[PDB]
RNA sequence: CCGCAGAAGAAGCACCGGCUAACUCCGUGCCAGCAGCCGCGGUAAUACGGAGGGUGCAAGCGUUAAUCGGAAUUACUGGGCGUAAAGCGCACGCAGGCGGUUUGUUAAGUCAGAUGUGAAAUCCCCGGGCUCAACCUGGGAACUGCAUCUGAUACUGGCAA
RNA sequence: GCUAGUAGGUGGGGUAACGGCUCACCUAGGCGACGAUCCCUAGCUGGUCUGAGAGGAUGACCAGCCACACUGGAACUGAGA
């Protein structure tokens, strides 16, 4: 599913924000976060392993969007190539074009980056798209439309786009609404958070 | 064994057999019905549980034990056989399931909608 | 029986060919002889799309097996 | 730097004339990145110092590699009742194999990246005691020493 | 006396090494005078006398490194009832990387490391880490 | 070139016709143990005079009789 | 591919006692019923029923049947037999399996090489083509194998001494 | 425990071709526990599924092979039924 409910009340029991309603909030700004989602359908205790073990594994699928099989695939290609099966992985994971466009600034929440390349404004070179997934890579060129460079939504998430670093592995043009995927991702520094030999652990039997 | 003896003779295979008498060739039989009968469980102190011999096809008049809110059901009539058992009843095979035929949705488990073909309900 | 033809190996409203020499007694998708070609309708800029053979596609029409009308006006395109 | 976490944690029944008698013991985690031994128990009478003294006493005694580059040279065995316990190689581009106890012991034993499995019965208590068995048959580089030099 | 000579060699010798004997002796054959050599190379053994008498036997002198000799892998595979046989590259790739493993080729008897790019395929009479 | 196959006679009486019992080694699949899985064929001497024990040399041909495809090519030596 | 209004027309299904992530309040009271297994309920049920809530999956979700896996629990890889399941009550011996030690010979087993062949499809290695993906596809390797042709003689077997 | 064109040999005949395929005569052999004979069940294969592998299971679509077309039997023309 693509969800379309509450996604701060997630926060709470997250422990981390994770880019809910990014714009001019975060964690307890009109809102209640950090709690438990539930009056005693669930509050705080000790934590069980198994719920660290389940929930670290959702942690990772959940910052891109994937569903249940896809990033299984992406497992088996990964363990499939002679390389780094940990690099890899989150290699796969990061070509998905909805991901891409938030790290051009392109909304302002990942939900919202998202559900721009939804709508026609979004474009890849000069093929047209409106697929949520797609092979992006080196020199490609993320490209804004006619009717893109109109609509008031897009230039209302270029604000935050100052206010994060944006990746050094992509230029990034928002003169002209462009920037190309020039190269490789670094996630040398994007694993900070991540640690792939719980999660591989897991999904082998 | 020695490998000059299993050259002669390798060794033997298990055989497969399940909770269902036959393995049937079913997950679903329709099967007619005998009469059902109420025993009491295993302990004089266990609560009893709705039985049921089955007029089977098969020849197989064997006893289902019926789930649900009790029944509406008559002796002749025609269920699916989930082929379940509960394991507080002894020598059962069979257990059965809800939903088409003669046997349909129970009432007020309309949050079960998948057991016993409940309809979600439209309130 | 045997013959030059074309054989799909497409999928639905994919026509992708596959010029064989195969049988007229299985089928052009049944038992082949030989493939001997490759070639593009849609004329696709794919890795090797087009391919007619010189050398079996002047042995076995020594002996007899005829082609078909593209690849008939395919012989002077590469210029064969 | 010390490494050391829990493994079991659990109760104990003795019968005196009429007694019940649970006494919380447990077993722990030792190692250090290079492995150390030590397991023990400690009674106690609420759950939080069935560990704490059980950690005391599983921090006796080091025990040393037999890795080089993260991962042994060498696949080896040992045994310890049903649990039978071996490791193969594993090749650098993976991440850290294995689940059950061999899951905990098999990192802070300074490995993050060795084959491993057990055959037979897994009994929790003596994998451990299985486990330990390989960090006595080592093909480390003074066995490369001592054929060479010996 | 002996059926598979070889397997009592072996057994005499790992029952000896470990009460750290000074040398024993075994009834000796063609084989177990070529084996004799790696062991003593690799350093297992001082050296190895076949004193021909009423018939050859081997009185190889136990080496020890400082009260040890240890082997921690041992088998009988190419042995009566079960002679089998390997080609050049289905050697036995055996632990520490530089580990042996006595096979016979077909010119001589050599090991694992030497005999594969040496081309000779053989029979493994065992496996040694 | 040609084949031909070392058999041993062990049962000749019937006129111009000896019988052969071929032992090749057969290993065993799942348990690799070669064993002596003897087959007897049939083959014609151009006069009988065999008995048992004799290696002869036999090769695959025409047939001449029924159960035929087999002749005596050479006897090896006798031990009748 | 262009235009046209208008969030409009587009969420469900199971589960939350332990294995196993995910509970409260009521009603019921070893009854009703639940239940893959271990097992639940005797009127203050995290296990039954409803409600509230929580959890996992999502245009599907859950149940069953069925086959392999886990199960190295039929074991060549990879199993036992004093007492846990298993050693005939005990000898003899035919077939079968097995053969101390040295030399000569042979090359069948065996080792090496060569050559065919090992269908297409399928796997993999490398690489493309469809808006992506599904799907489509090129070339290489694999095709573990088998027969044939020629050599090798350490081991295994034959023969001779 | 099995086998009378049964096992084999001559000479006849027949097939597109090799063959007891069939016959006349002649010999009395042949086969078998390395499992004959008989009994149960099944189309077979590339492959397929699963599985670390070995293995087990399996044979759907797709390709190849084989077999069958109301039942049984039979022949015709033809390179081909």
Redesign the interface.
């Given at each position: 599913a693509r969800y379309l409910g509450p996604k701060l009340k997630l926060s709470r029991r997250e422990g981390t924000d994770l880019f809910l309603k990014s714009g001019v909030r975060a964690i307890d700004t009109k809102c209640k976060i950090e709690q438990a989602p539930g009056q005693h359908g669930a509050r705080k205790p000790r934590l069980s392993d198994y719920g660290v073990q389940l929930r670290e594994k959702q942690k990772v699928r959940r910052i891109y969007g994937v569903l249940e099989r896809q990033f299984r695939n992406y497992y088996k290609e990964a363990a499939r190539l002679?390389?780094?099966?940990?690099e890899n992985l989150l290699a796969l994971l990061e070509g998905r074009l909805d991901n891409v466009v938030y790290r051009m600034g392109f909304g302002a929440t990942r939900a919202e980056a998202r559900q721009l390349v939804s709508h026609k404004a979004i474009m890849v070179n000069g093929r047209v798209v409106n697929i949520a997934s797609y092979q992006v890579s080196p020199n490609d060129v993320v490209s804004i439309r006619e009717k893109a460079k109109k609509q008031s939504r897009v230039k209302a998430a270029l604000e935050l786009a100052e206010q994060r670093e944006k990746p050094t592995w992509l230029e990034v043009d928002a003169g002209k609404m462009e920037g190309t995927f020039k190269r490789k991702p670094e996630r040398s520094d994007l694993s900070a958070d991540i640690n792939?030999?719980l999660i591989?652990?897991?999904y082998?039997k | 064994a020695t490998v000059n003896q299993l050259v002669r003779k390798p060794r033997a295979r298990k055989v497969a057999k399940s909770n269902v008498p036959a393995l049937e060739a079913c997950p679903q039989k329709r099967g007619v019905c005998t009469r059902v009968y109420t025993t009491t469980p295993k302990k004089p102190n266990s609560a009893l549980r709705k039985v049921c011999r089955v007029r089977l096809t098969n020849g197989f008049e064997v006893t289902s034990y019926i789930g649900g809110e009790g029944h509406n059901l008559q002796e002749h009539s025609v269920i699916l056989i989930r082929g379940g058992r509960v394991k507080d009843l002894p020598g059962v095979r069979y257990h059965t399931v809800r939903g088409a035929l003669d046997c349909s949705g129970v009432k007020d488990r309309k949050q079960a909608r998948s057991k016993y073909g409940v309809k979600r309900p439209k309130a | 029986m045997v013959t030059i033809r074309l054989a799909r190996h497409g999928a639905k409203k994919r026509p992708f060919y596959q010029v064989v020499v195969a049988d007229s007694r299985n089928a052009r998708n049944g038992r082949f002889i030989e493939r001997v070609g490759f070639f593009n309708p849609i004329a696709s800029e794919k890795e090797e799309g087009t391919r007619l053979d010189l050398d079996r596609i002047a042995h076995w029409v020594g002996q007899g097996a005829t082609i078909s009308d593209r690849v008939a006006a395919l012989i002077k395109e590469v210029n064969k | 730097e010390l490494q050391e976490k829990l493994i079991a944690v659990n109760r104990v029944s003795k019968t005196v004339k009429g007694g019940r008698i649970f006494s919380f013991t447990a077993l722990t985690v030792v190692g250090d990145g290079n492995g150390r031994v030590g397991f023990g128990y400690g009674k106690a009478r609420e759950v939080p110092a069935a560990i704490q003294k059980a950690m005391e006493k599983a921090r006796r005694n080091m025990i040393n590699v037999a890795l080089n580059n993260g991962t042994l040279q060498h696949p080896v065995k040992g045994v310890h009742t049903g649990s039978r316990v071996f490791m193969q190689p594993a090749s650098?581009?993976?991440?850290?194999?294995?689940?059950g106890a061999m899951?905990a012991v098999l990192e802070v034993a300074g490995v993050?990246n060795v084959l491993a499995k057990a055959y037979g019965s897994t009994n929790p208590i003596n994998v451990v005691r299985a486990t330990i068995d390989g960090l006595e048959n080592m093909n480390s580089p003074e066995m490369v020493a001592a054929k060479r030099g010996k | 006396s002996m059926q598979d000579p070889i397997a009592d060699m072996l057994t005499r010798i790992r029952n000896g090494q470990a009460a750290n004997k000074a040398a024993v002796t075994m009834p000796s054959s063609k084989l177990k005078v070529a084996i004799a050599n790696v062991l003593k190379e690799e350093g297992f053994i001082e050296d190895f006398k076949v004193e021909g008498d009423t018939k050859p036997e081997l009185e190889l002198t136990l080496k020890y490194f400082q009260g040890k000799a240890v082997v921690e892998s041992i088998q009988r595979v190419s042995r009566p009832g079960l002679r089998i046989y390997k080609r050049k590259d289905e050697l036995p790739k055996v632990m520490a990387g530089l580990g042996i493993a006595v096979v016979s080729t077909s010119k001589g008897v050599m090991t694992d490391r030497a005999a594969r790019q040496a081309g000779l395929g053989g029979e493994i009479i065992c496996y040694v880490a | 070139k040609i084949r031909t196959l070392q058999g041993r006679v062990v049962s000749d009486k019937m006129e111009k016709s000896i019988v052969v019992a071929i032992e090749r080694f057969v290993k065993h699949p799942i348990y690799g143990k070669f064993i002596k899985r003897t087959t007897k064929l049939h083959v014609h001497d151009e006069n009988n005079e065999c008995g048992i024990g004799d290696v002869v040399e036999i090769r695959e041909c025409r047939p001449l009789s029924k159960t035929k495809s087999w002749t005596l090519v050479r006897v090896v030596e006798k031990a009748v």
């Open positions: 002679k390389g780094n099966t940990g792939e030999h591989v652990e897991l082998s | - | - | 650098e581009g993976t991440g850290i194999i294995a689940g899951r993050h | - | -």
